[PDB]
Design a protein around this ligand. Structure first.
Ligand SMILES: O=P(O)(O)OC[C@H]1O[C@@](O)(CO)[C@@H](O)[C@@H]1O
Ligand SMILES: O=P(O)(O)OC[C@H]1O[C@@](O)(CO)[C@@H](O)[C@@H]1O
Ligand SMILES: O=P(O)(O)OC[C@H]1O[C@](O)(CO)[C@@H](O)[C@@H]1O
Ligand SMILES: O=P(O)(O)OC[C@H]1O[C@](O)(CO)[C@@H](O)[C@@H]1O
Lengths: 309, 303, 309, 309
């Protein structure tokens, strides 16, 4: 099993709180916030840790929020490689409403990154050994041009780093344009935005995903289908996995957990079907917990054994 | 194909309207309502008609709303067998909100049914020949005790009528208690209620469905799972079918029952029944299922 | 006291129902509907009946819904003069939601009125004796042109009929252009449109209302201020009446109840301050209920006695 | 004029952001937060400064957030007396939604205080001179028992400090139990709880307020009635004041501004009539502005001049 790294250009110190209900104007009494390390690549690395693997999270940390974020990852035993940033790590607020079981996510802009700080991040990424896997996950922070991310991916691939991209539509498109992306995970809206067409016919999603693989843009495409699970295709196989009919507490950490689970299997050189089933198991497991808590090992394992019957 | 009948103890004259936004207290301006036939069994009959089958809907019709309802089904070429009732047929309101694309469904109670009207409905049911299929679908109106429905199922079964039940709560429990129900289609909550336990484990839904079948209460249980499709079980087999990842808006449940009923009338396999049911349910959510949409999805599922 | 009549070009058979909560897509279970006679002028006449007065409601009634509407007015001791109409009387749905305590009100278009049917209504109006008061209230139905409504008001005034108008902004502006309207009840938005200017300074509402009276367009203007009650002005006096500090359950019936109360007082040749106080008492009383019941005699008298201290 | 101080046991660094839409589950893209000083007593001191008076805000401040809060009050030229606290000052979130114009207010628990910090706060209070006014306003931090609040009030009163209390519920009831509170400002619901009965009749609010005054628990009770203004009573008089029909946009900041205004009037030995009018003027002026903005001098004076004609 090869080494895994993640890159989070816009980390977040997430605070999760609970409040009886949600309405305008009045003071909504919230519980003392629970702090959790956030941001795409970081969540990916935490999920992998939860699942008994290891991934090194590369990211910029700034200010006390930054230090707080780093301290939490230490507690969760997630290895990090950090770059000191001037701008403070952002704080995003997640509000779980008891009355409705709904969760609301207020996502501020990522901390700015200056050209020098980005260079250091690039430096860390290019110290990655050939054949290792790099997951680039989360939004692009203010100050970072799309071209620079594109060049970084090209440089990384040039020295054998195997790249997974889960980000904005623009970054997604740009990454596929470089081609040979190990894995991408668009949802249906994102897939439609990618190929510029409505996916209305039964076979449309598969055809769109397969087209992306066949043109060499990505080696694997796993379309996230919400409650309908996931449809994954590579050059040879195609599989749709539907999650079991279980609870439904907090829909939020499903995506990053899925990517973490799939990356873990990718690292172990597993089959497409193992990868997709493990990804759906983990994403589903995540919905059993609060948003900021990702998948747990035991739940993932149980759902995976079931999905694999 | 055996003959097919449906029974709707609580029909509805459905009205649909459109309004810009939804908020409290203010007068929400709505477009002139549009009317269509409603009620579980009636929708089942309509779905079957869209799918090229024939089903006779048996139901009480009362007052001018009932007359409206009957006339609508006339224009739709759906065969009916009505009983004249005193209490006027209910009128439910479906509101489409432009700003959000959301739909709101206000469902009044079914019109009351006295003993004499139920009697007429029951005799209409017992006119059905042995081996035919009867779909009892929709809520139970006031003035109708569970025992009356129960005794109607027993009477129907005694003379060879094959009974499908799609209702909720006590009515469904009541039906299964009599047992030998050809098919029931609970959702996960209703299933949980029927077996009196939370269904949280991956295999919990299948086990609960299987428990109902094994007890002899139903021959087939098809658990509706919303966007996840359906899981079907019988004494011998289990099948789970997920729709294709096409578009959604919702008349799925009545269409699915209609589709599965047609298939049962054609002596289909469990697999064919559930696939066609899921196809029709999905087609309806692209209004009931159309023929071409249902066939297109069914073909894909049946590849 | 002179006799009172009302004119409702768009009656409504209101059905009132209750449901535990309101959310989209799902079947919302509502209680067996309760039916009330509805529509502007009809509600005015009902309020007047509740308050111990008598007002004959003139309106088109069509179909079984129209018959039901007529039967209900009989039960409330409201004298009627009806014209048979081809199109069936509309049915509006009022839903009270238990969990929130709020109401949602789905208002369909008024039934269509034929020219021949309008002619019959106009004929009923022009049989009213000189010196009597006519309240024209509610939206205009399809098939009725604004110019027809203004011509009716002109013809009415020509034979000594004292006209009160409560309608849409456009209808309101139209009636005022005719002028000599006994009373109008615009809200602040409408009032601002009428005088074509923003009302932003403390004295602006009063000045705007006074302007309408001074032009001869209306004899009295009573500006509805929601929770702040009403500000009434005539050629000589000005008064603002605020409702008592009690809970308001709804506000739909307030408008029509207020107009009914003020009309009654006008028929009794009461003072401006009596008129406005009685109007706010009746409006306030109406807001105590969920909507379609309007002001009760006892609530109004209690509130009126309080306000008149 | 006697000197004015305020006490905020639970200050807040108020963050505010803008987002186009609000709905569950999805990532709501918010703008980089803007900040302002927060907490009951702090806002009271801020309103007082706007109104031309001077009030010193006494409060705990912890961590970088505490420093941020202090800095912002410095930027507004508001006098403060702070105690350095170990637990970081809470950060509340105000969210404005563009699609709807609505605002959402997420109010976290106040930072905890230890024995030493609370002792320092009390020492600051008991350095206030006899005859001066102290406004204790806002929620109680977890860990600070009611008995601690009431002990503080009893001590302050012992050396002639005149105490005004704006809090809710149990804290207000406890304060009233000590008695001789110069001023309290319950809303109708709070008042109903204070006297343990539903206030349904027109004169019930006045009676309930008068009961509290008559008992000697408070010298003055001003009941805030939202858009209907306020009803104030003392041992001698009663007055209800409704604001002018000005345009309201955001109710937030109305309560604190109102307290600030009435406290300033009290410091000037104002009549009950002057005090309630100025409070309503300030409350009204605050709600003229969108967001969390407090009363301005010019808006308040304009409205008060009108009310005082
Ligand atoms: O006259 P409109 O604007 O069409 O609204 C009619 C609705 O309002 C009342 O007229 C209330 O004002 C109702 O009883 C009714 O259903
Ligand atoms: O004192 P509470 O109830 O915790 O509320 C604090 C909130 O109210 C203000 O004190 C407004 O009253 C704010 O600035 C703030 O964030
Ligand atoms: O990467 P984005 O689009 O800026 O969103 C960040 C949010 O998503 C997570 O990365 C969840 O996906 C969070 O912990 C977080 O606050
Ligand atoms: O049988 P129920 O539960 O009273 O629901 C009736 C509603 O559902 C349909 O039966 C759709 O299922 C309608 O046409 C209708 O108005």
């Amino acid at each position: 099993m090869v080494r895994i790294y993640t890159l989070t250009l816009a980390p977040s110190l997430d605070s999760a709180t609970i409040t009886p209900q949600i309405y305008p104007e009045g003071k909504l009494r919230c519980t003392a916030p629970v702090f959790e390390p956030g941001g795409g690549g970081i969540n990916v690395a935490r999920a992998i840790a939860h699942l008994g693997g290891s991934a090194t999270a590369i990211f910029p940390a700034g200010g006390a929020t930054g230090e707080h974020l780093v301290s939490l990852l230490a507690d969760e035993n997630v290895p990090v490689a950090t770059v000191e940033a001037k701008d403070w790590t952002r704080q995003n607020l997640h509000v779980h409403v008891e009355a409705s079981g709904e969760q609301y996510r207020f996502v501020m802009p990522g901390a700015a990154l200056n050209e020098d700080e980005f260079r250091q991040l690039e430096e860390q990424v290019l110290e990655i050994e050939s054949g290792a896997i790099l997951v680039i996950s989360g939004s692009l922070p203010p100050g970072v041009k799309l071209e620079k991310l594109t060049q970084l991916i090209s440089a990384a691939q040039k020295q054998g780093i195997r790249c997974i991209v889960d980000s904005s539509g623009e970054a997604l498109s740009a990454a596929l344009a470089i081609g040979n992306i190990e894995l991408v995970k668009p949802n249906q809206k994102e897939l439609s935005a990618l190929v510029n067409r409505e996916l209305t016919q039964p076979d449309d999603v598969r055809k769109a995903a397969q087209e992306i693989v066949n043109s060499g843009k990505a080696k694997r495409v796993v379309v996230s289908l919400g409650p309908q699970g996931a449809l994954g295709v590579d050059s040879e196989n195609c599989i749709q996995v539907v999650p079991p009919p279980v609870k439904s507490q907090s829909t939020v950490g499903a995506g990053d957990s899925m990517v973490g689970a799939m990356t873990l299997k990718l690292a172990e050189n597993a089959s497409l079907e193992e990868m997709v089933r493990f990804g759906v198991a983990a994403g589903s497991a995540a919905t059993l917990n609060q948003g900021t808590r990702l998948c747990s090992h035991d739940d993932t394992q149980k759902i995976y054994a079931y999905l694999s019957r």
